[PDB]
């Protein structure tokens, strides 16, 4: 197997003389070839924040990653790295790292803080802002990096092991595992023989794994987002015993949902990366799955539980209107999941933004109300044991009294009584 | 909301 | 490769409209052809406690998991569930499982408490025993799924790996995993037969929890495997307890059979109910027998060794109590592990781990005295130290002095002092 | 893929009718075609310690391991192994191992406490030294055992991403794995020595644990490849301490020698024991010459 | 008892 | 060893 050059969110050239480097939710980095050099582009979102510059690249470098403080630029042949901050504070520094015979440089990664920069022997090299040295650690070969503050989301390729992931820490003295090559579930590009002649069969040459971006959320916790165009959130990775990969959004779904339910072959989602609730992405339409020039405006995709069905939607159609009782369904599962990332994030890391407990206390709002609305259809149908075992994942005391004044509207006299068991034993267990 | 009224212009 | 819709024991229809769904202790679940639609049969062997009924499928269900509370039913390719509890007091109710583009139900699998349904594309969907779901996983490509109560094993396949395991705890509050995506040592299928294996490519005639929770697995070598030491993984093994093709070899007093084939079930302790089937085919056929009970052996027992003996198969005794040693000591360190962690399930561990750690010391006695009688002081030493009871021990010393060893009595003492010192800490 | 009978330092008999069954560091085991049986003959370089002894094979045994205390030997097709003391005080046992179709004993291992018999099926039967079986494990198809102390290395082969390495530790307790199936960084192999890969064909020449504890492999290759701390799943590396191709062309002046080849036995502390080969094959023949001792 | 009994019938 | 690999 060959490795490739990997950078999150990067185009191929393609049938062009143009691409993209690397695409976050901070600004995108181009590259357009100059006669025999090239013109690297750093643009950003935040036009007031930053401001857009442009050099000459006399190596060709084809890994590159963007963080809020400065550019990292890789060469993954002759292993030249360059880290250009943003601000003038700071200047740029240039290091060479070395490679053997055949190795190379297949994913680089900075923060304001960290540089890692990751090559196809699994050879980890980590740095500070500015360049000063850590340890020198020997893993699995590493095929894509991402980092966000002194943390790294590591995925690693074998012949034997296949795919997986690696999630550490880069203290001060030494690096630090959180998880150690545990099973990547990425579902892996499919290609065919008719693909030979497909027009994005160049993307899967330029990124055979499919990894079309991965990084950390807002709230840190890694995302990964394969060919399948599904967004894969861990879960619990503090918890080894727990960690769980969970899919909060199948964009194919919605673009489905916002396209009236007609199958279309002309939009694609691009992940730039997950505030909250919220995947800001780069909507493409065209024949291509990747972004060209000119790059549109960044849209905003909330994320949505993969548990709608076609079909039914169809029917109960007959933008696409999604019944509210299948809607709570989807609304009950997302906030649960929400709601225990965040509560996982404050526990360990506490705040990072300031407002993150008035958040966790909407999220559970919303958790008992859409749960509430799921107890009032099975009250509806008069299925009492369907209706007590969801008033059991209420979370606030309130939301049970208010099941309880929706079973006596539903004169279910038996259920009132074993909700308000629940209240006796939740103050039981509260005192002991 | 503004996303769906993209996706309906780019149909369109 | 092409995933095939899986569910515990079930058969394929060969050239006939009607096969089996699933099949374990709880009853057999059968589907005719009718026409456009199927018919589904719903049977139990406690015909005491459930009364057989049967429904039309308009949907062509091809998944099905059955448990003492209920049945649970599932279309590998349109993702269409429905649970049909036992009782009428409960109702019946029906989701549909969202798949992707090529995304079929390879598995399905329910409890009284929890819903589980495995997708070719690694989706792990889980449920309560009323339809709500808990959390939606992205897993390894899942190609088998059993449950009890609360923990789950599943079989998972990939083109890298080849075949890994998943050992997990559905919990009221997260999941946990004892073990996952380990190495699943079952062996694969290498014909009158094809049917099934294109129905089954992976040769898993079935997988179950044993009766006391331990994770077992029947492959195509008619062999059961039990994964000891799950909750330290560590010390994880897969053991193989019974050579079904030996036992039949057995007893059919030493004659190749072709014909006589063993369908599991599900473990209670040490035995293995199961259905005989006689025929051409590997898999059981319509109308079912009657299940059997073929108790666990250790793989000990060679062909050449007990056709001498002979000349049923007879087992020399000191064969059998080298082969009743092996298999206490398995059972007793699986029981063991049992209680010391989850407690009692059925009310008769306690007194069954007793009375199998007795069995254990008797076998091993019997090889101790047989080394006496060949004057081998050594390996009669070595027995004594594997001894569970104290007396056991005191046996031991009676048995070395009618062998007249007097060096032996010794040293077996100083076992019996050691151990009455640490009774001193 | 064909399931060879493998034994540490093992060679093939050739166009000859004797070859070495297994051999290491305490001596070499060798067996010869007679008119109808064999001859088992086991040496020892410590001939001030071990009593050289022989014995008629009726079984035609083609398996065999060599510890300090005992001689182990195994046939891979009839199942029959036996354990052969050194000391005359213990006595010989012989216990024939269940096998099914077209299942082979692939190697076995010995050490004065354990005694492991792996299949092509991937049967792990241990013993102690005596006979008494412990307990009987389902791995992956095995095809290269060996053991120290209560320590097991074994090597299986996948259909899937090809060889693997586990390692155990069979303790009074319960056996407890340290690596479970791992990545192989062994180099498979690629004439006059077309003989060998026939009787090997992973090219494994031996395997052995090193007198600090530590798993060792030679290649094909001809690389002593050592695991470091192994205890810390984190930190185990491969570290391929000994090219014996640099060796021996820098001690021959810097000509590049073909009639040279590199027999292992074992690995004690900071030297190499083993056998230097000169002629076409890279399989030492008759008589065996002296061990020599490579530095690390 | 029971099992070998039917593996007797189902023998010969 | 140097003695040995000069004899051969």
Known sequence: ?432 | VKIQETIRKLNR
């Open chain 1, 1 to 432: 197997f060959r490795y490739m050059p990997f950078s999150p969110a990067g185009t191929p050239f393609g049938f062009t003389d143009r691409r993209y480097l690397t695409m976050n939710e901070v600004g995108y980095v181009s590259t357009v070839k100059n006669s025999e050099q090239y013109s690297i582009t750093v643009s950003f979102f935040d036009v007031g924040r930053f401001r857009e510059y442009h050099f000459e690249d006399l190596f060709g470098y084809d890994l590159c990653f963007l963080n809020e403080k400065g550019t990292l630029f890789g060469q993954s042949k002759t292993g030249q790295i360059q880290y250009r901050p943003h601000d003038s504070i700071h200047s740029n520094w240039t290091k060479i790292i070395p490679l053997q015979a055949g190795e190379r440089i297949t994913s680089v990664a900075a923060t304001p803080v960290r540089v890692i920069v990751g090559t196809s022997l699994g050879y980890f090299r980590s740095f500070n802002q500015f360049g000063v040295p850590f340890a020198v650690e020997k893993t699995s070969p590493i095929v894509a990096l991402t980092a966000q503050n002194y943390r790294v989301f590591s995925v690693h390729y074998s012949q034997f092991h296949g795919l997986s992931y690696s999630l550490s820490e880069l203290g001060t003295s030494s690096k630090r595992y959180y998880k150690r090559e545990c099973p990547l579930p990425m579902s892996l590009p499919n290609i065919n023989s008719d693909m030979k002649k497909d027009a994005n069969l160049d993307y899967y040459n330029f990124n055979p794994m499919g990894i079309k971006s991965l990084f950390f959320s807002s709230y840190g916790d890694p995302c990964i987002f394969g060919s399948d165009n599904t967004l894969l959130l861990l879960s619990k990775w503090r918890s080894p015993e727990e960690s769980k990969w969970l899919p909060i959004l199948d964009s194919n779904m919605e673009i489905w949902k916002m396209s009236g339910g007609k199958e279309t072959t002309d939009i694609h989602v691009w992940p730039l990366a997950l505030a909250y609730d919220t995947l800001n992405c780069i909507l493409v339409k065209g024949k291509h799955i990747w972004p060209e020039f000119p790059l549109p405006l960044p849209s905003e995709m909330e994320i949505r539980m993969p548990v709608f069905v076609k079909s039914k939607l169809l029917e109960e159609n007959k933008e696409i209107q999604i019944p509210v009782s299948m809607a709570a369904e989807e609304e009950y599962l997302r906030s649960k999941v929400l709601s225990e990332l965040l509560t996982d994030t404050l526990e360990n890391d506490g705040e990072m933004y300031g407002n993150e407990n008035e958040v966790l206390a909407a999220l559970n709002g919303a958790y008992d109300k859409a749960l509430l609305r799921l107890f009032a259809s099975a009250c509806s149908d008069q299925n009492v044991e369907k209706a007590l075992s969801l008033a059991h994942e209420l979370k606030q005391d309130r939301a049970l009294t208010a099941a309880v004044k929706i079973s006596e509207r539903a004169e279910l006299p038996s259920l009132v009584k074993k909700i308000n068991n629940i209240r006796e034993a939740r103050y039981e267990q509260q005192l002991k």
